[PDB]
Subunit: 304 residues, 6 copies
C-alpha cells in the first residue's frame, strides 16, 4: 500500500530497516513470516506467480494450487482494496506476489537471512555470476549449504541439458513458489534459460521482492558468457536492478566478491570470499566494507 | 478542450501562468483542486489511469475504484462532448487523465507546490536522476519531506527487490491514482521498472500533466546507469520531455542541480542543492537563475 | 477523384494552382469552404479522422460526432463511389479525410491563408522545429496571432507535463477535427507525442491535406532534440514530406527560416523572420526567394 | 498459368516478346486488351487489388466494385482452375491481379505504350526518382502528356499535404484500379507514402505486372531523399525490381536518364532526356542504347 | 520416417546414394516416382504445399486440388502414423511435402535428372545467381531446355513487372505444385519476390527436398544485387543450404560455375559452363571436379 | 521436483553424479529407464514434446500418440502435483518432457552412454559443428555407428534439399520422440533448420535434458557458416548451453575436439579424434583431459 511520512516517522523507518539487516537475529524474519502464513485461513490464496503466458497461478499456505476461489475483497489500511478471484486454475482478479501482508509498515528491508564466516547475508535474490574460470554451480551449492546452517537448503533445477532437469517454465514457477513457501534457503540452478516470455520477465522483476518479503534467500547462477549485448545487457540489468545481493567472480581463481544491498536507501556492503574444491567438485567457502555507486558499475563492467 | 486567443487574451494567459508559479501562494492550486473534486457528485468518475494492457481503471473523488457506471455525456464550453462509461471494472468510454475539468482557462501552468530554502518548486512530475555517486533514493525522500513541509508526504513503492515492495504494474497505477487524489507531495520509489507495456508508456506520457493539473508533485527516481542506448535514450526523453522539473546529480558528491519548467512557453529556472547524510542514511538538504535550451542539453549529456 | 489532362487543361490547372497561392485574396479559400460546409444537409458526415486504434470517428458540419448513420452512397464526377456508414460511434464505411468534396477540379493547391509582414503564408500544415536556443512554443503562438489577424486562433494542447494538458490521443484528434471545422488558424502545442500508433501515423499523413483542402493552417511545434535516428529521422521525414510549410530555427537566436511549398509541382519559397520577447515570454515577429531541393536538404541537416 | 517450351517454341516466344516492344504499333496492346475487357460478360469480376489490410477488392469491366459474386470456377489451358468469389465487398476466393486472361501465350512482354521524340516507351510501371535538384512532379506530368499523345492522361493523387489530395490507401487503390481499367497513360503523384501495410507491399509488387498486362503505363514519382537505409533501400529495390522502366535524374539540372526493360530476358535500353520549364512550372521534354547489369547498379548508387 | 543402421546397412546406403547420382540412368528416378504416384488410389492426397498464411493446400496425383478429404490414418514401416484430413480447401491434418512415400529406404540422394554436354545434373533445386553482367534469366531458360533434352520444360512465372506475370504467392505455389507433379524439368522465373511470409519461408525450406524426392529439377533465378545484409544473407543462406545445386556467374561474362551436391554426406562437384547469345537473347550453353567446403564459401563470398 | 540437501546428502549426490559418468557400466542407465518405461500402465502418457505452434503432442511407452486422455493427477514425493490431460490430439494439461519420473533423486547426471576408442561418451545432446573443411554429416554417422556398438543407431532426417527428407517441423518432433522412446543412439541430420518458432525454441531447450534423463544420446549436426551474428550467436549459445557434449572441427582436416559435460557442477573433459574416409565417403574414427571455462570460450570463438 502507500505509506505517509514526516521527518520523525521517516527516521524511525530507516532505523528499523537498518536494524532488520544489521542487528535482528539472523533468520528471525523468516520465522515471523512462517507464523503469519500458518495462521492464514485454510484455502486462502497466499501467493500468485506468473506462468509463461503472463497469466498467474495461485497457491495456498501449503503450496497447493488453488484452482477455484470466489471473488473476495479486503480493504487495506491505506484505503486500497485487494480483490482475489481464481477460476479454472488461474487468477481472475488479484496481483502477482504475496496475497497476504507479511510486512506491515516494515517495508524496504533486506532481512538478514543468515550469518556465516563473520558476515551477515541478506534474504531476497542473490545472483551468482561473472566471467572467468571460477565455477558458478559449485558456488551456489556451497552458499546454499552455508546459509542453510542447521537447515537443509532446497534446490530448484531448471534448463540444463542434464538428467532429470525440468525445462518447462510453468513447472519451474511451481517449484519456486513451493520452495519459497516452505524453505529459508533456496538454490536455483540456472536462471540462464529464463534470460523472453511474459512470465520470464515477470519472474526476474518479482522474485527479489517475493523472497525479501518472506525473509528467504534465492541463490541463482547466471552465466554472462554470451557476446550478444541484447542478452549480456539483460544479465547486467538483472544483476544490477533485480538482485538484492550479487556474488561475482574475480581475477583470482576461487575468489569471489559479495555486494549486498542492506535496505531501502542504505549503503551496499562488500566483502571477499576464498574457496577451494574437495572431492567430486564439492566446494568449500573458507571462513577465517561500504562501497559507492561508482565501484558498483566497475564490477558490472566485468561481465563484458 | 481547445481555447481561442487574440493578442490581449493571450497576454492575460501568460500573465496568469507566470503568477501560478511565481506569486500564487505555495500549494494553493492543490487546495483549489481539492475543492473542485469535493464538489463532484457522489459516484462520479474523476480520474482514469492506464493499466498494463492499455485499458484504464477509473476512480471517484474518494479514490475508490468504479466498477460500473452507465454512459453519461457532458458537453464542455468549447463544444466538445465527454462521454464516460465504466463496465466490469474498466473504462468502456472516456479518456485517460482527469475526467472532470480542474483547470478551466488556466492551462499550461506549473502551479507552485511548495517553497523550501528560499526556492519555489513546481507541482507536476520531478525526475531525480544522473550518474555518479550521489544516491537518488535518499534524495527523493528528503525532497518529499521538504516540500511536504507541514504535511506528510505519500510514498508509492514499486519494483525493487526489497521487502514489501509491490512489483505488479496494475497495483502500481492504483497506488499512484489514490496518491494524487489525496496528497500534495508524492514520492515514487522506482520508476526504473516502468522504463515497455502500453500501460507503462501511457504512464510516462500522462503522469506529469495529471499532477500539474491537480497541483500535486510526484518525485520519482530514475537510474540512467544502463549502457543500452535504447533505454538510456528513453531515460533522457523522459527527463527532457515528460518531466515538469529535473533534479540531477553533479561531479561533486552531495550536490544537485534543479531545472524547473515554470510554465507553457516560459523560461526554465536552475538552482543548486547541497546535501548531507545523518544517521541511517537520512539525507538533509541544506538551506542557507534562468537557463537556455543549450544548457539543458548539456545537462542531459550527463546521462551517457 | 482522378482527373484527366492534355497540354491545354494541364496548363490551366497550373495557372490556377499558382494563383491560389500567389494572387487570390488571403484567406478567401477558407471562406469558400465554410460556405460549402454550411450548405451541407444536416446530419451529413463531413469529416473522418483516425483514432489511436486506426479506426475513425466522424463529424458533421457543426463539429459534433455522428454515432449512427445508415449506409449512403454518392457517385462522383469521375465515376468513383463514396459510401459512408457510421455505427456505434465508428466509421463502418468511408475514408479518412473530408467526406464532402471541398475542392472539385481545383486540387494540388496551397491556398494562401494569410499575409503578414509582407509575406503570404500557405494553409495546410506548418511544422515549427529546429535545434538550438530559439523557443518553439513562443513562436507558434506568435505565428498563430499574426496569421489570425482580425480572427482569434484556436489552440489544441497535447502531451506536455503542464496543467490541463490532455495526453490522450483520441481526445486530441477530436480537438483537431473541431478546430479545423471551425477556425482558419490553429496552433498545436506538441506534435512531439505523436512522433507509433496506427492513428498517429494516420494523423501525420492526413493533416496537411485536410487543412490545405479546408484552407486553414495548422501550426505545430516539434522538438528534434533526441539522438535516436529512429525518431530524429521521423522528424525530418515529417518536416520534409508531411508539411506544407516548414519554420526552422537558425544559428542566430531569435531568427527563423520559413520554407513554403506553394503548390503541386511548384517551387518552394523561403524568407527569414526576426523576433524578440516582451513581458511573460510573449514573442513578437518583426515586420519591416525561390529555393532548390539542395537548399531544402541542407536545412533538414540542421535537425541532427 | 505454366507454359511448356522446347528450343523451337522458346525462340518463337522471344521473337514475339522482342516484337511486342520493338515493332508492334505503339499502344496496340492497350487497344487489344480494351477489346478483351469490353467483351466480358457484364458483372464478371475482371480485376482484384489489395486494400490496406491485405484483403482484396474487386472490379468489373466498368470499374465498378463488385460486392457480391457467387463462387465460379474456370479451368485454364494448363489444367489449373481459377475460382472467384466475392462476399460483403471483398474477395473470398481468387487472386490479386487480372481475373480474366488478357495475354494468353504472350507473356513476359513490355508492350510498347507510345513513341515520342524518336523513342519507344514501355507500358508497365515507370518510377521517376533520383537525388538532386531536377523536379520529379513536373517530369511525371510532362511524360504523362507526351506519352498520352492524342489522348489525355489520368492523374491519381495520393499522400501529399496539398488541397484535395486523398491520403486514405483504400481510396487510392480504387482510383488506381479505375485508372488502369480506363486509360492508357496514368500518373501517380506520390508513391512516397506507400513506401509498410500488407496492401502497400502488395501494391509495389503487383502494379508493374498489372499495367504491363493491360498495355498501359503508370508513371510514379518517388523521392529517395531520406537517409534511412531501411527506406532508401526499399526505394532502390522498388526501382530495381518492381519497375518496368526507370527515369532518374542526373548531375546536370534538367537532364534525365531513361532505363527501359524491353521484355523477359531481354536487354535494358537507355537514352537521355533534356527538359526545360515554361510558365507556372509546366515542364517540356525536348525532342530533337543497350546497357549492362553493371551500368544499372551504377545508376542505383545515385540514390544514396 | 526414421531409419536404423549398423556399419553394413550404412555402407549399402552410401553405395546406393552414390549410384543414384553417378550411375543410374539420367531421369530414371523421375520415371520411377511417376509410377508410384500413378498407383495411388484415386482422390488420395499426394502433395501438400504452404500458402502465404502458412496453411497448406493439397493435390491429388493428377494435380487437382482436394477441397475435402475425411480423416485417414496410415501407419508407416517405422511405426509413425500419417493422418491426412482436408477441410474447406485446406489441410486440417497432415504435413507439408509428399503425402505418399516416394523414396522408401532410398533417401539422402540427389537423383540424376539429366546429362548434358558430358556432365550429370542433379534433380532437386538449382539456384542461378551471382553478381556481374552475365544475365540469369537467359541462363535458366537455356538450362531448362538443355536438361529437358527430349522433353519440354515447364516455366513458372512469378513477380516480375512484365505482361501476364502472376504476382500472387498463392497462385504461385499452386503452379509449382502442379509443375512438380507433372514435369521433370521446371524453371521458376523469379524467386526474387519470395525472398517474408510463413508461406515464403516454408517454400525455401521445402522445395529442394520436394523436387529431389520426385526426381525433378527446379531451376530458379535469384539476384543477390541488393546491399541489404538482411536480404543478401538470406540469398547466401538459400544458395548455401536450401539448394541442391548452385550455378553462379564469374568474372568472365558468359562463364558460369556449377556446384553440385551429389548426395547425403557426399562430396560436391564443380564444373564450368561457357555460353553465348543468339538472336533475341536466346542463350546457348556450349558443349565440347570435387571441391571442399572452403572453396564453397569462397564462391558464396561473390554475392556481397 | 525440488530436492533438499545438507552437507552430507549433497556430498553423496555429487559422488553419485560423478559415478553415473565415470564408473557406471556404459549404457546401463538406458537399460534402467527402458525398464521403468515398460512397467508403465498401458495407455499412460510418458512423453510430451512441443510442436511448431508451441502446443505439445503426447506419446505412450510404445511411441504411439495419445489423442485423448482424461485428466489424471499424481502427487510427487516433494509435494508437487502433475496433472496430465490430452484432448483432440494435444496436451491440455501437463508439461513438456518426461511425464513419468525416470530419475527420482538421481538428477544432474550425464549418464555414460557408451565407451569407444578408450573414451567414455555422455548421453544427452551432442552438437557436431565447427567451420572449416571437415564434414559434419560423415562424422555424425560415424559417431552414431561407433556409440551404437552392438546396436543399430536411429537416423532422424530433417531440412536438407535431398530425396526423402522431411522438412515439416511437426513430423520432425514426432520422429525425435519415437527415436528417444526406442533407441539409445540417435543421429539428427540437420538441426540447421530449427536454428524461430515456439516449438523450435522449446526443442533446443528441452532435448538435451530429455535425452540425458533417458540415457540415450542425440548426435546432431549444425553448420555455423552464416555470417549473421543473430544466427551465428544462436549456434554458439546452443553449443554452449543446450548441449551436453560438443564435437567441433579444428585447424587440421579430419581432426575433431570433443568437450564433454560430465555432470552437474562437475568439470568438462576434452579429447581429440582423428578420422579418415573410405569408399563412398564412409568415415572411420581412429582408435588407438579436464578443461576450464576459458578453454571452452576459446573453442566457441572458432564459430565466427
Ligand atoms: N575440481 C574442480 N577444480 C577446478 N574447477 C572445477 C572443479 N570442479 C568443478 N569445477 C568448475 O565448476 C564449474 C562447473 O559447473 P558448471 O555449471 O558446469 O559451470 P559454470 O557454473 O562455470 O557455468 C565449471 O566452471 C568447472 O570447470
Ligand atoms: N551514509 C551514506 N553515505 C554516502 N552514501 C550513502 C549513504 N547512505 C546511502 N548512500 C547512497 O544512497 C543510495 C542508496 O539508495 P539506492 O536506491 O540503493 O541507490 P540509488 O538511489 O543511488 O540508485 C546509494 O547510492 C548509496 O550508496
Ligand atoms: N524571455 C525569454 N527570453 C529568451 N528565451 C525565452 C524567453 N521566454 C521563453 N524563452 C524560451 O522559449 C521556450 C519555451 O517554450 P518551451 O516549450 O518550453 O521550449 P521549446 O519550444 O524551445 O521546446 C524555451 O526554449 C525558453 O527558453
Ligand atoms: N520554374 C522552375 N524552375 C526550376 N525548378 C522548378 C521550377 N518549377 C518547379 N521546379 C522544381 O520542381 C519540383 C516541384 O515538385 P515537388 O513535388 O514539389 O518536388 P519534387 O518532385 O522534386 O519532389 C521541385 O524540385 C521544384 O524546385
Ligand atoms: N544479347 C545479349 N547480350 C548480352 N547480354 C544480354 C543479351 N540479352 C540479354 N542479356 C542479359 O540477360 C539479362 C536479362 O534478363 P533479366 O531478367 O532482365 O536480368 P537478370 O537475369 O541479369 O536479372 C540481363 O542481365 C541482360 O543484360
Ligand atoms: N571422400 C571425401 N574426402 C574428403 N571429404 C569428403 C569426402 N566425402 C565427403 N566429404 C565431405 O563431407 C561433407 C559432406 O556432408 P555435407 O552435409 O554435405 O557437408 P557438411 O557436413 O560439412 O556441412 C562435405 O563437407 C564433404 O566435402
Amino acid at each position: 500500500m502507500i505509506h505517509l511520512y514526516d521527518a520523525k516517522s521517516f527516521a524511525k523507518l530507516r532505523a528499523a530497516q537498518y536494524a532488520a539487516f544489521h542487528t535482528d537475529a539472523p533468520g528471525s524474519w523468516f520465522d515471523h513470516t512462517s507464523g503469519v502464513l500458518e495462521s492464514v485461513e485454510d484455502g486462502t490464496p497466499v501467493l500468485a506467480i506468473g506462468v509463461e503466458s503472463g497469466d498467474a497461478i495461485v497457491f495456498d499456505k501449503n503450496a497447493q494450487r488453488i484452482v477455484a476461489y470466489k471473488e473476495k475483497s479486503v480493504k487495506a489500511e491505506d484505503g486500497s482494496v485487494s480483490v482475489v478471484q481464481v477460476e479454472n486454475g488461474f487468477m481472475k482478479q488479484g496481483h502477482r506476489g504475496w496475497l497476504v501482508d507479511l510486512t506491515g509498515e516494515l517495508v524496504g528491508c533486506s532481512p538478514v537471512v543468515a550469518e556465516f564466516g563473520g558476515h551477515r547475508y541478506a534474504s531476497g535474490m542473490v545472483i551468482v555470476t561473472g566471467k572467468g574460470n571460477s565455477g558458478k554451480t559449485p558456488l551456489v551449492h556451497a552458499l546454499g549449504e552455508a546459509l542453510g546452517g542447521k537447515d537443509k537448503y532446497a534446490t530448484v533445477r531448471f534448463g540444463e541439458p542434464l538428467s532429470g532437469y525440468n525445462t518447462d517454465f510453468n513447472v519451474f514457477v511451481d517449484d519456486i513458489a513451493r520452495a519459497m513457501l516452505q524453505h529459508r534457503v533456496i538454490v536455483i540452478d540456472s536462471l540462464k534459460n529464463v534470460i523472453i516470455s511474459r512470465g520470464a520477465f515477470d519472474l526476474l522483476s518479482d522474485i527479489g521482492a517475493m523472497a525479501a518479503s518472506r525473509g528467504c534467500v534465492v541463490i541463482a547462477s547466471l552465466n554472462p558468457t554470451s557476446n550478444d549485448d541484447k542478452i549480456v545487457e539483460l544479465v547486467k540489468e538483472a544483476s544490477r536492478s533485480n538482485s538484492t545481493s550479487l556474488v561475482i567472480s574475480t581475477d583470482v581463481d576461487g575468489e569471489w566478491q559479495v555486494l549486498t544491498r542492506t535496505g531501502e536507501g542504505l549503503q551496499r556492503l562488500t566483502h571477499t570470499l576464498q574457496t577451494s574444491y574437495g572431492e567430486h567438485s564439492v566446494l568449500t567457502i573458507h571462513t577465517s566494507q561500504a562501497s559507492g555507486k561508482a565501484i558498483q558499475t566497475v564490477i558490472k563492467n566485468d561481465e563484458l
